[PDB]
Amino acid sequence: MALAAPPGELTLALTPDDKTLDPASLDRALAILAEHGILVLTGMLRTRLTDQLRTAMLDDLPEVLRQQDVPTNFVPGHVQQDPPVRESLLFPDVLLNPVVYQITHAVLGADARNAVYSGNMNLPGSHEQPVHLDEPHLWPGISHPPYCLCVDVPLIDFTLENGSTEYWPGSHVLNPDECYDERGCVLPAELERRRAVAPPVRFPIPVGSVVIRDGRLWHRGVPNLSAAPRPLLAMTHYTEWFDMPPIQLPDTVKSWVDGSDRHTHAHFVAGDVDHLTGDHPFA
């Protein structure tokens, strides 16, 4: 079902000045994540920040496309691309956003940590991804609470035309036997059973927005039918006890990243980090 704006049931409208949500707003935010598994927060990030990140990823795309094996998510046109980890492009309001961490602290605990700083470049003429979850349930056939929240940052206006992500509301709690293949794709029989009860939604998302969703939420990338690549910056917050490799960051940001009560699972490196290949000498 294809809408003209983020649906009110999933959406909290903010400004870049909002540092923390009042108790009633936080309760509504958590009730949406619990019931629907996806929360859209509009107006969170200044144009100044999203401009620089968009520019930096579009400037890097040639280097990504020049690789012998171009890393692709499931199908052509969905390119895996990490944004730069240069000091000049690492922003506290993006990595350590006070509203994001207020929400992930309330869901995952005070010791929750960001362990992903990545991205999805959706190219013109891209194919339809299969419906999947990014993070699996921890045991098959078992109902358990969240252990991870994906934090998606559109770097342009997302439209129905340019590949705004398809989301399956309430799909984050579903874990019947034989539901997921080895790639985290939803088996077609389970897809169609769910569609009858709670069909998916797709909607425009204005740049400045942050989407927070259960890492187990069913979703898929869809064709970008615009003339321009559609960049997404992706982070994921995990419970402290979930094993993840650290984010490689330059030690020029160690002072404000390692200080924070907004935790990052980070390894600090002497030089510049190679964000595209991970091929710096003490990786």
Added chain:
Amino acid sequence: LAAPPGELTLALTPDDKTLDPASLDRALAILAEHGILVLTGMLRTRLTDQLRTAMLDDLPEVLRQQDVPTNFVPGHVQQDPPVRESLLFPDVLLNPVVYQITHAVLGADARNAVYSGNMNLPGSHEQPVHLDEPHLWPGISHPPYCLCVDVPLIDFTLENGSTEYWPGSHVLNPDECYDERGCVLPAELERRRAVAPPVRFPIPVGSVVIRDGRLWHRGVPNLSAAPRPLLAMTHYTEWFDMPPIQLPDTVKSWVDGSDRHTHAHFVAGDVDHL
């Protein structure tokens, strides 16, 4: 009790490399219901003799340290066994029956991430009832993510500090039950005691105890004249974050090869286990 209770016990020999389907089903049913399984006759005397000797030989050096690491109360000393090539045995680190059980409970990607020990000294105090590994969310019922594998290195008796176990306690996770150290709140202890009181029983050397890492238990006074050494391992789901075990690269060939996974860091030369 005078012996491991039949409801919790499977009798093996060191020749048993696999449990038949019926024995495995019974093993998993005991772990699911009671959270603790005693397997008698698993390890050869030759192996437990060497590990016992090595830990008793190290104890003077351990007690000479300025800060002696102690679990909760006096006499419960944290002591790692040596990770010398000569004292790392496939039948201890990579036991085929242990991994058959932990594979069936935690999955094929389950891994050992602990190679440690508990030296219970003469005159030791009573530990508070605790779990070694917490529930992953408060107020929630979920399946196991870890199995403790305890290897007594002498005969454990009621006299020398055989561990107190709370059968069935591994599934209990009501709100306000556990403090920051994993100790059970006294009100929850007494509610549980009325329904399923704890047990203490002798465990002969050669035995392996497999238990849910969330099982309520406590170390008790060793009233004998001899230290009571325990070797401790813990298997975790692949997704549970743990620091690796430091091992010498002289065992990398048979540890890293195996479909019995270890979360290991391999070092050139000897590792300092103290």
